[PDB]
Curated annotation (Swiss-Prot):
This is GTP-dependent dephospho-CoA kinase. Optimum pH is 8.0. GO terms for molecular function: GTP binding; kinase activity. Coiled coil: none annotated. Keywords: Coenzyme A biosynthesis, GTP-binding, Kinase, Nucleotide-binding, Transferase. It catalyses: 3'-dephospho-CoA + GTP = GDP + CoA + H(+). InterPro entries: deph_CoA_kin_Thcocales, GTP-dep_dephospho-CoA_kin. It holds the Pfam family DUF359. Changing N86A: Decrease in activity. GTP binds at G23, Y29, D46, V47, V48, D65, K67, E120, D143. It comes from Thermococcus kodakarensis (strain ATCC BAA-918 / JCM 12380 / KOD1).
Length: 170
């Protein structure tokens, strides 16, 4: 029992959901480093995740493809790795549970890496739902730059509306 995009939503979400920060790797990352300093950070995408690490911020949660070409390097002590299956165009129950779990583990000062089989792109929705106010959520606008979401009451509503607008499949 899962949520699925509708044609309408698919088109709507083509456009940034927070502040788009324009430019090629790695400009947007250097432009936002200062803000990322100041708040907990969630990244969606292997490239986004990597590039936040490179500017010297540690995400409290990262979501990326299980099949990415990536490796551990000392981090890998208080770091937790969860897997979840999440097909293209869906937000599954498993994803919701995994993300919420991750926020739990972050409260106890663990950084969480969520390895997704399928697509992690929509994970930004639950990320906002479950995050403490003032958290920052980041994902990649391809060929444009990076989208920075600030978790506010306002934006918890929009993200809840998106879920409410999705098709529920039994």
């Amino acid at each position: 029992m899962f949520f699925r995009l509708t044609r309408e939503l698919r088109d709507e979400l083509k456009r940034p959901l927070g502040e788009l920060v324009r430019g090629p790797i790695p400009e947007p990352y250097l432009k936002v480093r200062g803000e990322l300093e100041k708040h907990p950070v969630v990244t969606v995408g292997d490239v986004v995740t990597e590039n936040v690490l490179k500017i010297g911020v540690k995400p409290i949660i990262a979501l990326y493809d299980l099949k990415t070409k990536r490796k551990e390097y000392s981090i890998e002590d208080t770091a937790v790795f969860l897997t979840v299956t999440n097909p293209p165009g869906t937000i599954t129950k498993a994803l919701l549970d995994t993300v919420r779990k991750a926020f739990g583990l972050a409260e106890r000062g663990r950084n969480v890496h969520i390895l997704v089989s399928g697509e992690e792109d929509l994970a930004a929705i639950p990320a906002v739902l479950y995050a403490p106010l003032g958290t920052l959520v980041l994902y990649g606008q391809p060929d444009e730059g990076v989208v920075l979401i600030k978790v506010t009451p306002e934006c918890k509503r929009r993200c809840a509306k998106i879920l409410a607008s999705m098709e529920v499949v039994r």
